[PDB]
Amino acid sequence: MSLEKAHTSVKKMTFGENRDLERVVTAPVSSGKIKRVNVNFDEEKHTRFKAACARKGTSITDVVNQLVDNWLKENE
Amino acid sequence: MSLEKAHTSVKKMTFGENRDLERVVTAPVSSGKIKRVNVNFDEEKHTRFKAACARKGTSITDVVNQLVDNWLKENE
């Protein structure tokens, strides 16, 4: 113990020297899953969007995701 | 007289008196005719967005305005 016995620092510090790997590689694969696109529509497009939003009962951001869904899976 | 000269703009020098009507009332008109929205597109929706747009020779921004116009004119 004269050697503090803490010299091992918990056996060469088993803290996680193996856990050093910590290859959880969180690498936010979910992050990329979403992108942002700033688009500017016409005044009429906005008014019609509001009516379409209330008619479909959904958010203003969801409706846009819908038109893209009707164009991405159709036009392609 | 010199005094009159002082107020040579007596009548009002028509500085813009007749212009006071301010036809400027003519708001830009184009005012707010363009509204932004900023949407969120899935990784899959974005990957096919650039691919499809590159095929039809359309700007990524114009593509969004296209699907919006379609869904807003087909569903409405």
From TrEMBL, chains A, B:
The lineage of its organism: Bacteria, Pseudomonadati, Pseudomonadota, Gammaproteobacteria, Enterobacterales. One of its GO terms (biological process) is negative regulation of DNA-templated transcription. One of its GO terms (cellular component) is protein-DNA complex. This is Plasmid partition protein ParG. GO terms for molecular function: core promoter sequence-specific DNA binding; DNA-binding transcription repressor activity; identical protein binding; nucleic acid binding. Keywords: Plasmid. InterPro entries: Arc_rbn_hlx_hlx, DNA_partition_ParG, Ribbon_hlx_hlx.
